[PDB]
Amino acid sequence: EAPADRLKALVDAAVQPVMKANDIPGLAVAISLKGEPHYFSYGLASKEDGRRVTPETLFEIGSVSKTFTATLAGYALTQDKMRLDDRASQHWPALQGSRFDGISLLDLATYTAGGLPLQFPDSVQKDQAQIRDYYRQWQPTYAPGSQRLYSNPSIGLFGYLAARSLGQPFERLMEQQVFPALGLEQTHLDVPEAALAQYAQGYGKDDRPLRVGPGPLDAEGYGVKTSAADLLRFVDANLHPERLDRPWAQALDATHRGYYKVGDMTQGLGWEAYDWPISLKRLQAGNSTPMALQPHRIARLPAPQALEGQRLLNKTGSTNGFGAYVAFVPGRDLGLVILANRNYPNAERVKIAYAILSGLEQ
Ligand SMILES: *C(=O)[C@@H]1[C@H](NS(=O)(=O)O)CCN1C(=O)N[C@H]1CCCNCC1
Numbered sequence: 001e002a003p004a005d006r007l008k009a010l011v012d013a014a015v016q017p018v019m020k021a022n023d024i025p026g027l028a029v030a031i032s033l034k035g036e037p038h039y040f041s042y043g044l045a046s047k048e049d050g051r052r053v054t055p056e057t058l059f060e061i062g063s064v065s066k067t068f069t070a071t072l073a074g075y076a077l078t079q080d081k082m083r084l085d086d087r088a089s090q091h092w093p094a095l096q097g098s099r100f101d102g103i104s105l106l107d108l109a110t111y112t113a114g115g116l117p118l119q120f121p122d123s124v125q126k127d128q129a130q131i132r133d134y135y136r137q138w139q140p141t142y143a144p145g146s147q148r149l150y151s152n153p154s155i156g157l158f159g160y161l162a163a164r165s166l167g168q169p170f171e172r173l174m175e176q177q178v179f180p181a182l183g184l185e186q187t188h189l190d191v192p193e194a195a196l197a198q199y200a201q202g203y204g205k206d207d208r209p210l211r212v213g214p215g216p217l218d219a220e221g222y223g224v225k226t227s228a229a230d231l232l233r234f235v236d237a238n239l240h241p242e243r244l245d246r247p248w249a250q251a252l253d254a255t256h257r258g259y260y261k262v263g264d265m266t267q268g269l270g271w272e273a274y275d276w277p278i279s280l281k282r283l284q285a286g287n288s289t290p291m292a293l294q295p296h297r298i299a300r301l302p303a304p305q306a307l308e309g310q311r312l313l314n315k316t317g318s319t320n321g322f323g324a325y326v327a328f329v330p331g332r333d334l335g336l337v338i339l340a341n342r343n344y345p346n347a348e349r350v351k352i353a354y355a356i357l358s359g360l361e362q
């Protein structure tokens with residue numbers, strides 16, 4: 001019983017102090033190790049009705065959704081419906097004559113379009129015309145392809161245009177094609193009524209209840225609600241794309257290609273990669289507020305780099321009431337998911353993950 005005992009002891013030791021310190025009501029861990037899933041569930045999905053977290057509890061994953069968006073784009077790309085060097089306006093006539101004539105799909109996907117902001121301004125509602133108008137009027141702060149500024153409207157437009165290239169709405173493609181191709185039956189953009197009992201409550205300041213509301217390009221940027229078990233299934237698809245039908249294998253591979261570096265981080269479609277091993281402090285810095293909020297000059301690669309082998313691929317994501325983190329090591333067939341119903345600092349999420357990964361190495 002030693003191995004099961006040791007894994008429980010390790011995950012408990014990593015998770016419990018961080019949950020206490022960040023007053024996290026409920027937290028789900030899922031780990032893929034040596035080809036088997038392992039689940040560890042903590043606390044409450046809802047403090048008020050006493051629903052406990054399980055591996056089936058649905059959490060908002062926020063920007064981790066971008067890795068799903070990237071997978072749909074990978075499908076469009078490897079199906080020859082778009083190319084990364086296409087100008088954005090090729091895929092939406094509304095953008096012809098705008099600055100998007102001079103901005104590539106790759107620029108949008110990797111946040112280098114020239115200063116698209118972190119979020120849509122509050123003045124832009126979930127409305128196709130308002131979104132249209134927003135992009136039509138937007139002007140770059142600096143040359144496209146030169147600086148990374150992490151941005152929902154940037155990758156949101158990338159996903160929206162990938163959907164246009166496939167001739168169907170983004171949301172429909174996700175529900176009808178992407179999630180089924182990945183074997184995901186507990187993963188939603190719009191949680192069905194019959195599944196609402198599984199949907200955790202989110203918690204903010206003074207423990208106010210917070211579930212995510214509608215916003216422009218929400219599906220593309222931050223729309224996914226999923227369970228720890230389903231998100232680990234997605235990690236396993238990423239660890240083994242060859243286990244999927246060829247078109248989807250290629251779609252996943254397209255999210256494992258790096259285009260430039262900023263500091264220790266290599267930017268793919270959705271996924272962000274680090275050499276492994278690397279220090280906890282460096283991994284935290286790559287997932288820090290200044291990394292997200294400030295423009296960084298890029299070091300472009302001479303050719304796309306395979307994000308595999310001795311690397312850690314990760315993504316953080318948050319909503320007002322939730323905080324998610326996913327990390328995997330391709331060359332070790334190892335992955336983990338940490339989902340919580342409080343938006344707690346990225347550094348703390350990474351701290352839990354690092355403690356688990358370090359302990360599995362020891
Ligand atoms: C993604 O989660 C982005 C950003 N990602 S990061 O943690 O990698 O920097 C953190 C917040 N964020 C959002 O998408 N925020 C949305 C949260 C939903 C409520 N308003 C829309 C903004």
Ligand SMILES: [Cl-]
Pocket residue numbers: 118119120152153215216221
């Ligand atoms: Cl936004």
